[PDB]
Amino acid sequence: MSKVVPIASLTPYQSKWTICARVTNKSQIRTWSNSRGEGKLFSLELVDESGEIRATAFNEQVDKFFPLIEVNKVYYFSKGTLKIANKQFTAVKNDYEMTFNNETSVMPCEDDHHLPTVQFDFTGIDDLENKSKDSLVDIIGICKSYEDATKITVRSNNREVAKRNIYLMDTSGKVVTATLWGEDADKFDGSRQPVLAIKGARVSDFGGRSLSVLSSSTIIANPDIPEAYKLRGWFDAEGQALDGVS
Amino acid sequence: MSKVVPIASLTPYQSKWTICARVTNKSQIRTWSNSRGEGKLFSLELVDESGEIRATAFNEQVDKFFPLIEVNKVYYFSKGTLKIANKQFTAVKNDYEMTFNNETSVMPCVQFDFTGIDDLENKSKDSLVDIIGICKSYEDATKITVRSNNREVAKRNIYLMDTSGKVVTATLWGEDADKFDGSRQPVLAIKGARVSDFGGRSLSVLSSSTIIANPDIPEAYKLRGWFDAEGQALDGVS
């Protein structure tokens, strides 16, 4: 049954395909009526290692699949059609969208195949130097070292906020400073040298190039992802590597 | 370091060259004596896509490269000397033969179709598969002998495991059995072992087989790292 192929390789009019993906999001059933009558639909956003794709099931397939598909699980999806996407209605970047037909099947999986839990589009650390200030990025690297947190308070009131710098490195030997605030800064645990995947960080040139972890950014620690393994694994092997700013 | 040219394109008094090829043959060290004293040399056969060529290294160079060239590997050979070949001492097709001097340098440089350890119960007996797995443990080696004479071969079982969480027993014999080094939990990339059912489902590392330890490839780093984060909880043998 592993004739599965990557989401990012689906093009319209493709012979046939079957993908392995985690459902990261699912809408509620949508209903509409027009001169022709009523209709209903729901959408999912599927994720695998290579990418992401938004999918929609209409009328009958709503009845069938709505109840059979829960949020963070993994499933084998096969046969559906693909078309150019309506990017004005989604943040998914994929050039195409998948729509279910009445010969579309969805099979639950035993394990998660080490599929990510959110969509990550990683800019290797060595490529951060190319991104313009203020641009968003998803990165992943191992912790080279970390500073202690500082409590920054406003003298007038009781507002106060932890700030903290950490330093990551991937297999390219390059390091970036990532800045953490509030909850993230406080909670950091540099124990056992963790791999951090960071989604939606912002590149800052303020005070020197770096990456700011916004409230809106997401940080996953040691996700069970092949990239996280490649890193950790490469550290053990050749993690006696010195370092390199930027 | 990729200014290399096909072995077949080489000629003597050539401008300058570098080649990438497999030492498909190394002779031992040949010693000789005349009235200028002792002297040694050792030759090699070198093949590439274009063709093949015999190379010789004398005295000092032997000392240097003898240890550095492993029979079935691959290398970056540069700037030796080429002459019309003495075809009566070799079967190498080439019109020319290569020879090494102190201004000659050799720096290092297979491919497998991996079958997941968890999908070997899908392979059938005596079929030839390639696996990659991190060592889970090893036994010490046992010297199997022949009472009759002075023949003896080492035998040792090692145990591999990939992310599937499954564990295969691989059997090593002779040289392979004798130098297996369990230190630092190595990753082993075995090409061409034999699925075998004799004493249970296991892998047989034959002479025809070849083992790369801690390859410099993506599935290897992946394995070591996964073992760190989830290579404590274990087993699920056969």
Coordinates of C-alpha atoms in Angstrom, one line a residue:
Chain A
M1 CA 0.0 0.0 0.0
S2 CA 3.0 2.4 0.0
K3 CA 2.6 3.5 -3.6
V4 CA 2.2 6.8 -1.7
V5 CA 3.8 9.7 -3.4
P6 CA 4.6 13.2 -2.1
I7 CA 1.9 15.9 -1.9
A8 CA 4.3 18.3 -3.7
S9 CA 4.4 16.0 -6.7
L10 CA 0.6 15.9 -7.4
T11 CA -0.2 17.7 -10.7
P12 CA -3.5 17.8 -12.4
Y13 CA -4.3 14.9 -14.7
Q14 CA -1.7 12.7 -13.0
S15 CA -2.1 9.0 -13.7
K16 CA -3.2 8.2 -10.2
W17 CA -1.9 8.8 -6.8
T18 CA -2.3 8.0 -3.2
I19 CA -0.8 10.2 -0.5
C20 CA 0.0 9.9 3.2
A21 CA -1.0 12.9 5.2
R22 CA -1.9 14.4 8.5
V23 CA -5.0 16.5 8.7
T24 CA -4.0 19.7 10.5
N25 CA -7.2 21.5 10.1
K26 CA -10.8 20.8 9.2
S27 CA -13.8 23.1 8.7
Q28 CA -17.4 22.6 9.7
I29 CA -19.8 21.7 7.0
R30 CA -20.7 24.6 4.7
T31 CA -24.1 25.0 3.2
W32 CA -25.5 26.8 0.3
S33 CA -28.5 27.0 -1.9
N34 CA -28.9 28.4 -5.5
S35 CA -31.5 28.1 -8.4
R36 CA -30.4 24.5 -8.6
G37 CA -31.0 23.7 -4.9
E38 CA -28.9 23.0 -1.8
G39 CA -25.4 21.8 -1.5
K40 CA -22.8 21.3 1.3
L41 CA -19.1 20.9 1.6
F42 CA -16.2 21.0 4.0
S43 CA -12.5 21.5 3.6
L44 CA -9.3 20.0 5.0
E45 CA -5.7 21.1 4.9
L46 CA -3.4 18.1 4.5
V47 CA 0.2 18.0 5.4
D48 CA 3.1 15.6 4.7
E49 CA 6.8 16.1 4.5
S50 CA 7.0 17.7 1.1
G51 CA 4.1 20.1 1.4
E52 CA 0.6 20.9 1.9
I53 CA -2.8 20.9 0.1
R54 CA -6.2 22.1 0.8
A55 CA -9.0 19.7 -0.1
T56 CA -12.7 19.9 -0.4
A57 CA -15.5 17.2 -0.3
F58 CA -18.9 18.1 -1.8
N59 CA -22.4 16.9 -1.0
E60 CA -22.3 13.1 -0.9
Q61 CA -18.7 12.9 0.1
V62 CA -19.5 15.2 2.9
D63 CA -21.9 12.6 4.3
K64 CA -19.3 9.9 3.9
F65 CA -16.1 11.5 5.0
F66 CA -17.1 14.2 7.4
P67 CA -17.6 11.8 10.3
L68 CA -14.7 9.5 9.3
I69 CA -11.9 12.2 9.4
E70 CA -10.7 13.6 12.7
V71 CA -8.2 16.5 13.1
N72 CA -4.7 15.5 13.9
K73 CA -4.6 12.0 12.4
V74 CA -2.9 10.6 9.5
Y75 CA -4.5 9.0 6.5
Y76 CA -3.9 7.5 3.1
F77 CA -5.8 9.6 0.5
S78 CA -6.1 8.4 -3.1
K79 CA -7.9 9.5 -6.2
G80 CA -9.3 13.0 -6.4
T81 CA -8.9 15.7 -8.8
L82 CA -6.5 18.6 -8.7
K83 CA -7.0 22.1 -10.2
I84 CA -5.2 25.5 -10.0
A85 CA -5.9 26.8 -6.5
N86 CA -8.1 29.7 -5.4
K87 CA -5.3 31.2 -3.3
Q88 CA -7.5 34.1 -2.3
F89 CA -9.3 31.8 0.1
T90 CA -6.5 30.1 1.8
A91 CA -2.9 30.6 3.1
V92 CA -1.8 27.3 1.7
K93 CA 0.9 28.0 -1.0
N94 CA 0.5 24.9 -3.1
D95 CA -0.3 25.7 -6.7
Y96 CA -3.2 23.2 -6.8
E97 CA -6.1 22.1 -4.6
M98 CA -7.6 18.6 -4.4
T99 CA -11.3 18.0 -4.6
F100 CA -12.8 14.6 -3.7
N101 CA -15.0 12.7 -6.2
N102 CA -17.1 9.5 -5.5
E103 CA -14.2 7.2 -6.1
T104 CA -11.9 8.9 -3.5
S105 CA -10.8 6.7 -0.6
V106 CA -9.4 7.6 2.9
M107 CA -7.7 5.0 5.0
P108 CA -6.6 5.5 8.6
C109 CA -2.9 4.7 9.5
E110 CA -1.4 2.7 12.4
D111 CA 1.5 5.1 13.1
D112 CA 2.0 8.7 12.1
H113 CA 4.9 7.9 9.7
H114 CA 6.8 10.6 11.4
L115 CA 4.6 13.1 9.7
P116 CA 4.9 16.7 10.8
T117 CA 2.0 18.2 12.9
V118 CA 2.0 21.6 11.1
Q119 CA 3.1 22.8 7.8
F120 CA 6.8 23.7 7.7
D121 CA 8.5 25.3 4.7
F122 CA 12.1 25.4 6.0
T123 CA 14.7 27.9 5.0
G124 CA 18.0 26.3 5.8
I125 CA 20.0 28.5 8.3
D126 CA 22.7 29.2 5.7
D127 CA 20.1 30.7 3.4
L128 CA 18.8 33.2 6.0
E129 CA 21.3 35.7 4.8
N130 CA 19.2 36.0 1.6
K131 CA 15.9 36.9 3.2
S132 CA 14.9 40.5 3.6
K133 CA 14.4 42.1 6.9
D134 CA 10.8 41.7 8.2
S135 CA 10.2 38.5 6.1
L136 CA 8.7 35.4 7.7
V137 CA 10.4 32.0 7.8
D138 CA 10.2 28.4 9.1
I139 CA 13.4 27.0 10.4
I140 CA 14.8 24.0 12.2
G141 CA 18.2 23.5 13.8
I142 CA 19.9 22.1 16.8
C143 CA 20.7 24.2 19.9
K144 CA 24.4 25.3 19.8
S145 CA 24.0 27.2 23.2
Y146 CA 21.6 29.4 25.0
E147 CA 21.7 32.4 27.3
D148 CA 19.9 32.7 30.6
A149 CA 16.6 34.6 30.6
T150 CA 16.3 38.2 31.6
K151 CA 13.2 39.7 33.2
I152 CA 12.4 43.0 31.5
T153 CA 10.0 45.1 33.6
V154 CA 8.2 48.4 33.1
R155 CA 9.0 50.5 36.2
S156 CA 5.6 52.1 36.5
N157 CA 3.5 49.0 36.7
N158 CA 3.7 45.2 37.1
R159 CA 4.1 44.3 33.4
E160 CA 7.3 42.4 33.0
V161 CA 8.5 40.1 30.2
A162 CA 11.3 37.5 29.9
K163 CA 13.7 37.9 26.9
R164 CA 16.2 35.2 26.0
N165 CA 18.6 34.4 23.1
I166 CA 19.2 31.0 21.9
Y167 CA 21.5 29.8 19.1
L168 CA 20.7 27.1 16.6
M169 CA 22.7 25.4 13.9
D170 CA 21.8 22.9 11.3
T171 CA 24.1 20.6 9.4
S172 CA 25.6 23.5 7.4
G173 CA 27.6 24.7 10.5
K174 CA 25.9 28.1 10.4
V175 CA 24.2 29.6 13.6
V176 CA 21.5 32.2 14.1
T177 CA 20.3 33.9 17.2
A178 CA 16.7 33.4 17.8
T179 CA 15.1 35.7 20.3
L180 CA 12.4 34.4 22.7
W181 CA 9.9 36.5 24.8
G182 CA 7.5 35.8 27.6
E183 CA 6.2 32.2 27.9
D184 CA 8.7 30.9 25.4
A185 CA 11.7 32.5 27.1
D186 CA 10.7 31.4 30.5
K187 CA 10.0 27.8 29.5
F188 CA 13.1 27.1 27.4
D189 CA 15.0 24.0 28.4
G190 CA 18.4 23.6 26.9
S191 CA 18.5 20.2 28.6
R192 CA 19.8 17.4 26.4
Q193 CA 20.4 19.9 23.6
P194 CA 17.0 20.0 21.8
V195 CA 16.1 20.3 18.1
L196 CA 13.7 23.2 17.6
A197 CA 11.5 23.7 14.5
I198 CA 10.2 27.2 14.4
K199 CA 7.3 28.3 12.2
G200 CA 6.6 31.9 11.5
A201 CA 9.6 33.5 13.0
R202 CA 10.6 37.0 11.7
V203 CA 13.9 38.0 10.4
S204 CA 15.2 41.1 12.1
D205 CA 18.1 43.4 11.4
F206 CA 17.4 45.2 14.6
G207 CA 20.5 44.9 16.8
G208 CA 22.1 42.6 14.3
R209 CA 20.6 40.0 12.1
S210 CA 18.5 37.4 13.9
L211 CA 15.2 35.8 14.2
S212 CA 12.4 37.0 16.5
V213 CA 9.9 34.5 17.8
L214 CA 6.6 36.3 17.8
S215 CA 3.5 35.5 19.7
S216 CA 2.2 34.3 16.4
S217 CA 5.2 32.2 15.8
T218 CA 5.1 28.5 16.7
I219 CA 7.9 26.5 18.3
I220 CA 8.0 22.8 18.3
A221 CA 10.7 21.0 20.4
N222 CA 12.2 17.7 19.1
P223 CA 9.3 16.9 16.8
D224 CA 9.5 13.3 15.5
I225 CA 10.4 14.4 12.0
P226 CA 13.1 13.1 9.6
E227 CA 14.6 16.5 9.5
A228 CA 14.9 16.7 13.3
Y229 CA 16.6 13.2 13.2
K230 CA 19.0 14.1 10.4
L231 CA 20.1 17.0 12.6
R232 CA 20.4 15.2 15.9
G233 CA 22.1 12.4 14.1
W234 CA 24.5 14.6 12.3
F235 CA 25.3 16.3 15.7
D236 CA 26.3 13.0 17.4
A237 CA 28.5 12.1 14.4
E238 CA 30.1 15.5 13.7
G239 CA 28.8 17.8 16.4
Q240 CA 32.2 18.7 17.7
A241 CA 32.0 21.4 15.0
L242 CA 33.0 24.9 16.3
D243 CA 30.5 27.4 14.9
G244 CA 29.7 30.4 12.5
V245 CA 27.5 33.6 13.0
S246 CA 24.9 35.1 10.5
Chain B
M1 CA 38.3 18.9 -7.1
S2 CA 36.3 17.9 -10.2
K3 CA 38.7 18.8 -13.1
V4 CA 39.0 15.0 -13.8
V5 CA 39.1 13.4 -17.2
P6 CA 38.2 10.0 -18.6
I7 CA 41.0 7.4 -18.0
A8 CA 40.8 6.7 -21.8
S9 CA 41.6 10.3 -22.7
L10 CA 45.1 10.2 -21.1
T11 CA 48.3 10.4 -23.2
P12 CA 51.9 11.0 -22.2
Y13 CA 53.5 14.4 -21.9
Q14 CA 50.0 15.5 -21.4
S15 CA 49.4 19.0 -20.1
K16 CA 48.2 18.0 -16.6
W17 CA 45.5 15.6 -15.3
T18 CA 43.4 14.2 -12.5
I19 CA 41.2 11.1 -12.6
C20 CA 38.5 9.4 -10.5
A21 CA 38.5 5.6 -10.6
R22 CA 38.2 2.4 -8.7
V23 CA 41.3 0.4 -7.7
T24 CA 39.9 -2.9 -9.0
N25 CA 43.3 -4.6 -8.2
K26 CA 46.3 -4.1 -6.1
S27 CA 49.3 -6.3 -6.2
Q28 CA 51.4 -6.9 -3.1
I29 CA 54.8 -5.3 -2.6
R30 CA 57.5 -6.5 -5.0
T31 CA 61.1 -6.2 -3.7
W32 CA 64.2 -6.3 -5.9
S33 CA 67.9 -6.0 -5.7
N34 CA 70.6 -5.1 -8.2
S35 CA 73.7 -3.0 -7.8
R36 CA 72.0 0.1 -6.5
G37 CA 70.5 -1.8 -3.5
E38 CA 67.0 -2.8 -2.6
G39 CA 63.9 -1.4 -4.2
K40 CA 60.2 -2.1 -4.0
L41 CA 57.0 -1.2 -6.0
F42 CA 53.4 -2.4 -6.1
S43 CA 50.9 -2.0 -9.0
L44 CA 47.2 -1.3 -9.3
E45 CA 44.6 -1.8 -11.9
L46 CA 42.3 1.4 -12.3
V47 CA 39.0 1.4 -14.0
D48 CA 36.6 4.2 -14.8
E49 CA 33.7 4.6 -17.3
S50 CA 36.1 5.2 -20.3
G51 CA 38.4 2.3 -19.8
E52 CA 41.2 0.9 -17.5
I53 CA 44.9 1.4 -16.8
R54 CA 47.8 -0.3 -14.9
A55 CA 49.8 1.9 -12.5
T56 CA 53.0 1.3 -10.7
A57 CA 54.5 3.0 -7.7
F58 CA 58.1 2.6 -6.7
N59 CA 60.1 2.6 -3.5
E60 CA 59.3 5.8 -1.5
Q61 CA 55.8 6.1 -3.1
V62 CA 55.0 2.5 -2.0
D63 CA 55.8 3.4 1.5
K64 CA 53.3 6.3 1.0
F65 CA 50.4 4.9 -1.0
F66 CA 50.7 1.3 -0.2
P67 CA 48.7 1.9 3.0
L68 CA 46.4 4.5 1.4
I69 CA 44.9 2.5 -1.4
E70 CA 42.3 -0.1 -0.4
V71 CA 41.5 -2.7 -3.0
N72 CA 37.8 -2.1 -3.9
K73 CA 37.5 1.7 -3.2
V74 CA 37.6 4.8 -5.4
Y75 CA 40.1 7.6 -5.6
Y76 CA 41.3 11.0 -7.0
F77 CA 44.6 10.2 -8.7
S78 CA 46.7 13.1 -9.9
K79 CA 49.7 14.0 -12.0
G80 CA 51.7 10.7 -12.4
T81 CA 53.6 9.8 -15.6
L82 CA 52.4 7.8 -18.6
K83 CA 54.4 5.5 -21.0
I84 CA 53.7 2.9 -23.7
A85 CA 52.7 -0.1 -21.7
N86 CA 54.6 -3.4 -21.4
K87 CA 51.7 -5.5 -22.6
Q88 CA 53.5 -8.8 -22.0
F89 CA 53.0 -8.4 -18.2
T90 CA 49.4 -7.4 -18.1
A91 CA 46.0 -8.0 -19.6
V92 CA 45.0 -4.3 -19.2
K93 CA 43.7 -3.1 -22.6
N94 CA 45.4 0.3 -22.5
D95 CA 48.2 1.4 -25.0
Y96 CA 49.7 3.3 -21.9
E97 CA 50.6 2.4 -18.3
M98 CA 50.7 4.9 -15.5
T99 CA 53.5 5.4 -13.0
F100 CA 53.7 7.5 -9.7
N101 CA 56.2 10.1 -8.6
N102 CA 56.5 12.3 -5.5
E103 CA 54.4 15.0 -7.2
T104 CA 51.5 12.4 -7.3
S105 CA 48.6 12.6 -4.9
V106 CA 45.7 10.3 -4.2
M107 CA 42.7 11.5 -2.2
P108 CA 39.5 9.4 -1.5
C109 CA 35.9 9.7 -3.0
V110 CA 28.6 2.3 -3.9
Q111 CA 24.8 2.7 -4.2
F112 CA 22.1 0.5 -2.7
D113 CA 18.4 0.1 -3.0
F114 CA 17.4 -0.3 0.6
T115 CA 14.8 -2.7 1.9
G116 CA 13.4 -1.7 5.2
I117 CA 14.2 -4.1 7.9
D118 CA 10.5 -4.3 8.7
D119 CA 9.8 -5.4 5.1
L120 CA 12.1 -8.4 5.0
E121 CA 9.4 -10.7 5.9
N122 CA 8.3 -9.7 2.3
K123 CA 11.6 -10.8 0.8
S124 CA 11.9 -14.5 -0.1
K125 CA 14.7 -16.9 0.9
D126 CA 18.0 -16.7 -0.8
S127 CA 17.1 -13.3 -2.3
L128 CA 19.8 -10.6 -2.3
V129 CA 18.8 -7.5 -0.4
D130 CA 20.5 -4.3 0.8
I131 CA 19.6 -2.9 4.3
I132 CA 20.9 -0.1 6.5
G133 CA 20.4 -0.2 10.2
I134 CA 22.0 0.9 13.4
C135 CA 23.6 -1.8 15.4
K136 CA 21.5 -2.8 18.4
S137 CA 24.1 -5.2 19.9
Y138 CA 26.7 -7.7 18.9
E139 CA 27.9 -11.1 20.1
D140 CA 31.7 -11.8 20.4
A141 CA 33.1 -13.7 17.5
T142 CA 33.5 -17.5 17.6
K143 CA 36.4 -19.3 15.8
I144 CA 35.0 -22.1 13.9
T145 CA 37.5 -24.7 12.8
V146 CA 38.3 -28.0 11.1
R147 CA 39.8 -30.7 13.4
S148 CA 41.3 -32.2 10.3
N149 CA 43.7 -29.3 9.7
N150 CA 44.6 -25.7 10.2
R151 CA 41.5 -24.1 8.5
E152 CA 39.5 -21.8 10.6
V153 CA 36.9 -19.0 10.1
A154 CA 35.5 -16.5 12.5
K155 CA 31.6 -16.3 12.9
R156 CA 29.7 -13.5 14.6
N157 CA 26.1 -12.3 14.7
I158 CA 25.4 -8.6 14.9
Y159 CA 21.9 -7.0 15.3
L160 CA 20.6 -4.2 13.3
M161 CA 17.5 -2.0 13.8
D162 CA 16.0 0.8 11.6
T163 CA 13.2 3.3 12.5
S164 CA 10.6 0.7 11.8
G165 CA 11.6 -0.5 15.2
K166 CA 12.3 -4.0 13.9
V167 CA 15.6 -6.0 14.5
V168 CA 17.4 -8.3 12.0
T169 CA 20.3 -10.7 12.8
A170 CA 23.1 -10.4 10.3
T171 CA 25.8 -13.1 10.2
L172 CA 29.4 -12.2 9.6
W173 CA 32.1 -14.7 8.6
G174 CA 35.9 -14.5 8.3
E175 CA 37.6 -11.0 8.0
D176 CA 34.2 -9.4 8.4
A177 CA 33.5 -11.3 11.5
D178 CA 37.0 -10.6 12.9
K179 CA 37.1 -6.8 12.6
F180 CA 33.5 -5.9 13.3
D181 CA 33.9 -3.0 15.7
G182 CA 30.8 -2.3 17.9
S183 CA 32.2 0.9 19.3
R184 CA 30.2 4.1 19.0
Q185 CA 27.1 2.1 17.9
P186 CA 27.7 2.1 14.2
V187 CA 25.3 2.4 11.4
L188 CA 25.9 -0.4 8.9
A189 CA 24.9 -0.2 5.2
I190 CA 25.0 -3.7 3.9
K191 CA 24.8 -4.2 0.2
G192 CA 23.9 -7.6 -1.2
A193 CA 23.4 -9.8 1.8
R194 CA 21.4 -13.0 1.5
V195 CA 18.0 -13.4 3.0
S196 CA 18.3 -16.8 4.7
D197 CA 16.0 -19.0 6.6
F198 CA 18.2 -21.8 7.8
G199 CA 18.4 -21.1 11.5
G200 CA 15.7 -18.6 11.6
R201 CA 15.1 -15.6 9.5
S202 CA 18.4 -13.7 9.3
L203 CA 20.8 -11.8 6.9
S204 CA 24.0 -13.4 5.6
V205 CA 26.9 -11.1 4.8
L206 CA 28.8 -13.0 2.0
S207 CA 32.1 -12.3 0.5
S208 CA 30.3 -11.0 -2.5
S209 CA 28.7 -8.7 0.0
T210 CA 30.1 -5.3 1.1
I211 CA 29.6 -3.4 4.2
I212 CA 29.9 0.4 4.6
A213 CA 30.1 1.5 8.2
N214 CA 28.6 4.9 9.1
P215 CA 28.1 5.8 5.5
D216 CA 28.1 9.5 4.8
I217 CA 24.5 9.5 3.6
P218 CA 21.1 10.8 4.7
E219 CA 19.5 7.6 6.0
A220 CA 22.6 7.0 8.2
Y221 CA 22.4 10.4 10.0
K222 CA 18.7 9.9 10.2
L223 CA 19.1 6.6 11.9
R224 CA 21.6 7.7 14.5
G225 CA 19.5 10.7 15.4
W226 CA 16.3 8.7 15.6
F227 CA 18.0 6.2 17.9
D228 CA 19.0 9.1 20.3
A229 CA 15.4 10.5 20.6
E230 CA 13.7 7.1 20.4
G231 CA 16.4 4.4 20.6
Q232 CA 16.1 3.5 24.3
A233 CA 12.7 1.8 24.2
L234 CA 13.4 -1.4 22.2
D235 CA 13.3 -4.8 20.4
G236 CA 10.7 -6.6 18.2
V237 CA 13.3 -9.1 17.0
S238 CA 13.0 -11.4 14.0

